[PDB]
Amino acid sequence: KNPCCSHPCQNRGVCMSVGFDQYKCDCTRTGFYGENCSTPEFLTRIKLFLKPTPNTVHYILTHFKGFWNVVNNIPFLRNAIMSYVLTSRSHLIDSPPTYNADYGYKSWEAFSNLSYYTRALPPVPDDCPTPLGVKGKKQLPDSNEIVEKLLLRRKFIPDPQGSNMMFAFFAQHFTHQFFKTDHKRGPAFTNGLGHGVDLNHIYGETLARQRKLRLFKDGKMKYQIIDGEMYPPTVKDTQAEMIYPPQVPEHLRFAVGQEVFGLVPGLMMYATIWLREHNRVCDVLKQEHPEWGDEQLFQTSRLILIGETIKIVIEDYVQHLSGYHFKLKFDPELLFNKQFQYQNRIAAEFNTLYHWHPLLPDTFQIHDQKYNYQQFIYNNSILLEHGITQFVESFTRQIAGRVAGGRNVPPAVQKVSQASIDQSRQMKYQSFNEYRKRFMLKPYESFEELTGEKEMSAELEALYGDIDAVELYPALLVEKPRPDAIFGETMVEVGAPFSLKGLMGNVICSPAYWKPSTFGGEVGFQIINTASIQSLICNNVKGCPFTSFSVPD
Amino acid sequence: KNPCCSHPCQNRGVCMSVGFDQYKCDCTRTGFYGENCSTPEFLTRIKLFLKPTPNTVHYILTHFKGFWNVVNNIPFLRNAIMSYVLTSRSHLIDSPPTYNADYGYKSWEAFSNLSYYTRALPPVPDDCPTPLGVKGKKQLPDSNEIVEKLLLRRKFIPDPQGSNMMFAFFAQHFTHQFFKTDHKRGPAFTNGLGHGVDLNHIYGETLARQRKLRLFKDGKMKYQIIDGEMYPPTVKDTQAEMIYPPQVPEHLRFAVGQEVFGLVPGLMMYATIWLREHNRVCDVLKQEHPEWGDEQLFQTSRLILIGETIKIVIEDYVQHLSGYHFKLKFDPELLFNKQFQYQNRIAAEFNTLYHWHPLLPDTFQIHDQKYNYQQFIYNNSILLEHGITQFVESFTRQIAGRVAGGRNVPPAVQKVSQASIDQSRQMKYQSFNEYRKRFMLKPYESFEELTGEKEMSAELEALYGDIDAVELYPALLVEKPRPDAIFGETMVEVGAPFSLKGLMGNVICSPAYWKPSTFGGEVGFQIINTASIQSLICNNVKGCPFTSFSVP
Ligand SMILES: *[C@@H]1O[C@H](CO)[C@@H](O[C@@H]2O[C@H](CO)[C@@H](O[C@H]3O[C@H](CO)[C@@H](O[C@H]4O[C@H](CO)[C@@H](O)[C@H](O)[C@@H]4O)[C@H](O)[C@@H]3O)[C@H](O)[C@H]2NC(C)=O)[C@H](O)[C@H]1NC(C)=O
Ligand code: COH
Ligand code: COH
Ligand SMILES: *[C@@H]1O[C@H](CO)[C@@H](O[C@@H]2O[C@H](CO)[C@@H](O[C@H]3O[C@H](CO)[C@@H](O)[C@H](O)[C@@H]3O)[C@H](O)[C@H]2NC(C)=O)[C@H](O)[C@H]1NC(C)=O
Ligand SMILES: CCCCCCCCO[C@@H]1O[C@H](CO)[C@@H](O)[C@H](O)[C@H]1O
Ligand SMILES: *[C@@H]1O[C@H](CO)[C@@H](O)[C@H](O)[C@H]1NC(C)=O
Ligand SMILES: *[C@@H]1O[C@H](CO)[C@@H](O)[C@H](O)[C@H]1NC(C)=O
Ligand SMILES: *[C@@H]1O[C@H](CO)[C@@H](O)[C@H](O)[C@H]1NC(C)=O
Ligand SMILES: O=C(O)c1ccccc1O
Ligand SMILES: O=C(O)c1ccccc1O
């Protein structure tokens, strides 16, 4: 019935019903006119003709290494390039945010209610001819059949880019401070009201929890000392609730900022390292400020660690997955002369696309031991047996799975993968092709074009019938990867805007915050601008083991 | 003992303690350098030497009537001028926000906790030589003594700008959506978590309260018809709680968004009027969109009303207030090629400077009747007796009191005035002069310079001893008014940045929102862009009485 069900408005124009039988497109500031915002005004024809395709730009960034080695070493060029990267990427994000699961039109409820994920595309209206709008069959395919035929791993497919378990667990640990789906009320809702990198997965989401985890001496967080090494405190000692199955003995019930980080020893590894880092920075600041009290020591350490996080994400983590010969830079000053909003709201689609379960290995190799999922899960004694050093050394050397390219989701997390499909349907996601359009990509014209292959594409056809009916999550995981890359085109072109906006949008990157006095002075400031994944481990892990997000060659 | 107690860092530098006896100034992006951020850069001392005083800028805007009168009618020039007015003001506001009453250094707790008012200036550190830091006497003067000698009305002083009761109640009604002090917690905390113009004083602060006030038909808000006229619903009906004394009977306990608007019939008047406007807009939107449901009709009406509010506040309210010949313009597009943050956090100091009690008259005159405070307070019964039309006609013609110049606070609200001073001290406000500097104003060199007068300046020296020890709130009320103006310069040069930032920083003013589809098409969009205080009354008040913010 609803005339906007066909999504007729192109190029980010806004659809609106005008009576029962008609719609109107609001083309305001799209760069297009016409009844569907599909006629480029003169200046847009210029930009469009000159705009190089993402696969073209990816090629340039991933070749000509000698050229990039020069660019990387003349700050003016490196600054200029990193700047354009930042501004052109984040330009694709609505800020202040707009839609959520319950509102396909602008509303104060959608704007102001922080309990919702925001939405990059509005939900499909409730009464449309087909679940995605007007394209596809009256009912979407069985999600289980989708997972089995297209997603489930037959043979482990290693990541060609060489991503390891340090990468995989960093990704899980980092993103779960802002992907905290509140399933008690629905997939549309989040428990992370900071909607960004606030490090609540270390410090706790609420003040009450933070007070349970803090030592209230020297700004430090509570800990226990096992084998001369520092670990998180217990649930018993903190009264900070955690999710642990009954059979987990209480001395192994570690208490950390995020309730679920006891699920995997890989997560508890990072929680332990970051906890050490907090108390390390406390020691540094106390030496620099012996007049300071516990509260200021705590708050300043937190701000610094937020800065470390952001620095490491851009210059080690995003750097790794990009494959760029160009050296990414964390530098808030790049935006001080640019139009940029220092705020962000976590999008549900960003959550969906970050469901990188194919990364997970068939078993976890630590030292000379292999653990299946039954053995690894909720087993902190594994962490204690080997220690963090061995954990880093092993995880640095174990390869992760390729995310794109299909058929690499471990059967152990089958239902998780199916849930991603089901929940996206509950939240009335639009199609994969609509999301490509939303981020200035050409929609795929056929199933074979999407996969670059004849087998899986054929399965997609028999299930979906129309290429415009393929859903966001499955299509991201079966898309043709870029040459020897972990991801396909759409993952990166949709992902990076969400990510870079979230990172640079952080309040500490704003002019009023980005100054030495915010971080306790010059020494504190320096801790941020010299941070790396290697330094994070070297400072907090015994023996200073080598580490990296890729397996050594 | 705190080295930063003297507020050594000038020009918005950041003080930090380095050891028990030493400090360091962070002069980053101040445009200054040196130990105390006192020495200007070349670029800045040039910009400094050629930037005119606000008193000069004020004169220019308040004279040359003939010149401005043609400027107002050339859209290009009006836009350019309005564009600068916006950008210069707002740049004085830290955004994203920084300090609050509990944090004199930047912290995640200060940034993220919305239950606090933010602070334009950090609190005086606890362990300090004097309550204000370093200057002044060991103990501040008795707050009641300040009120009595300097603030209490001895004889009504009318506003020379002619502000009326329509103005005074608009001011109170509009600001009390974002000045909602959580007194149970402390003066440092707010119940207005939206921190701006969200019209929670109409729709309620929470979804739960909103659903008690809504009708869930045609997007409308609940109401009752009394003597053929639309009035807010009751507490009995909505179950939305209100603050009323037991003396008020059930049928007179009107329920509106803001819990305290039962206190004053002038507030309930505006509540009623804005209620009617909402339902009026629903009717318009329904004619345009027969296909729309109740929920979309409600939300779109709300967005439109937010727009009407910002429009009316800038082009009528701040316009009257300013006394400018230039016609201020509400136009979000003026900022689309400027750097500007569409976010805001309500400053405690913004709350304090808005304590404009001297506006209040000796009595309230509705038609042939006069009511003292005791009779007027919580009296919905006399709202029904006269009706909104009569309320508007009367309020338009009754003059308000002058806010600056001292000694014009109604004795009836004496202890409110004292509470304003006490709460300032509880929140550890810095001195008036520090706040002058904070907003790029020359500090006052003497008491006499502050009042331009001999008698009150003498009392201030007896009480405070040092000009650098005078507190923000009393100084604002005794400051030498601008000529024939309601305010002195400090009220304006501090208040306008808070105010314009919070107006233009509203989400509907952002590029993603400022478009006709947001408001249901051009018909809805046009409701915003042609709204005024006179049209708001003509549309929703029987008889379409003339109305203004100044007396006829
Ligand atoms: C952000 O959006 C969320 C999703 O809409 C909001 O969560 C929802 O909040 C509502 C309202 O608090 C809650 O509904 C409530 O329904 C009952 C009435 O509708 C209420 O019980 C009432 O019983 C009597 C009337 O029925 C009345 O006399 C009594 O005083 C109660 O008022 C019941 O307790 C229930 O809580 C939804 O359950 C909730 N939904 C979800 C999925 O969480 C959230 O509030 C929004 N946040 C903000 C700040 O507005
Ligand atoms: C790199 C990303 C990554 C990794 C490595 C990872 C590794 C692992 C892992 C390793 C041993 C296990 C047992 C799980 C198991 C789960 N994951 Co992930 N997950 C990841 C990204 C996500 C995200 C993102 C969500 C949903 C976020 C939310 O809303 O809470 C998720 C959801 C889940 C859920 C809840 C289902 C749902 O929210 O729909 C389970 C259970 N999973 N995952
Ligand atoms: C802006 C103009 C204005 C007007 C016209 C006005 C008119 C009136 C009025 C009759 C019309 C009465 C009976 C009062 C009485 C009060 N006002 Co005002 N007030 C005004 C501005 C304010 C502000 C601002 C606050 C503090 C708001 C907050 O924190 O909630 C305030 C606070 C109060 C308080 C709270 C006391 C405290 O602890 O601070 C009382 C009582 N008053 N006021
Ligand atoms: C914003 O900051 C507020 C001020 O710190 C904070 O309010 C404080 O909240 C804590 C909750 O942990 C309360 O702590 C006490 O609460 C009860 C009752 O006493 C006890 O069971 C606790 O153990 C503890 O003693 C404080 O009373 C409360 N303080 C005030 C002045 O309200 C808010 O919680 C902060 N907001 C957010 C979102 O974190
Ligand atoms: C309502 C009157 C105030 C009562 C409190 C008395 C405090 C001292 O009030 C005195 O009042 C005089 C009136 O013109 C002033 O000239 C004096 O300067 C003032 O100190
Ligand atoms: C957890 O790991 C320990 C070894 O560290 C092992 O002995 C134990 O059986 C494991 N728990 C399981 C497999 O449930
Ligand atoms: C800086 O301020 C301090 C405040 O005590 C003052 O004593 C000192 O002379 C000033 N120094 C300079 C270089 O301005
Ligand atoms: C309101 O009306 C008159 C004022 O003259 C007074 O007699 C009456 O008691 C007042 N009622 C309330 C509830 O204040
Ligand atoms: O930064 C990216 O390129 C990116 C892409 C996809 C998902 C998460 C990401 O950080
Ligand atoms: O708009 C102003 O100039 C102003 C000044 C002081 C207080 C509130 C205000 O809106």
UniProtKB/Swiss-Prot annotation, chain A:
A GO CC term attached to the entry: neuron projection
Impact after mutating residue 544 to S: Does not affect activation by nitric oxid (NO)
Main localization category: membrane
Cysteines joined through disulfide linkages: 4-15, 5-128, 9-25, 27-37, 538-544
Record site feature (Aspirin-acetylated serine), residues: 499
Glycosylation sites per record: 36, 113, 379
Cellular localisation: Microsome membrane; Endoplasmic reticulum membrane; Nucleus inner membrane; Nucleus outer membrane
Active-site residues, Swiss-Prot/TrEMBL: 176 (proton acceptor), 354 (for cyclooxygenase activity)
Gene3D superfamilies: Haem peroxidase domain superfamily, animal type, Laminin
Membrane-topology annotation of the record: Peripheral membrane protein
Record protein name field: Prostaglandin G/H synthase 2
Organism of origin: Homo sapiens (Human)
Gene from which the chain derives: PTGS2
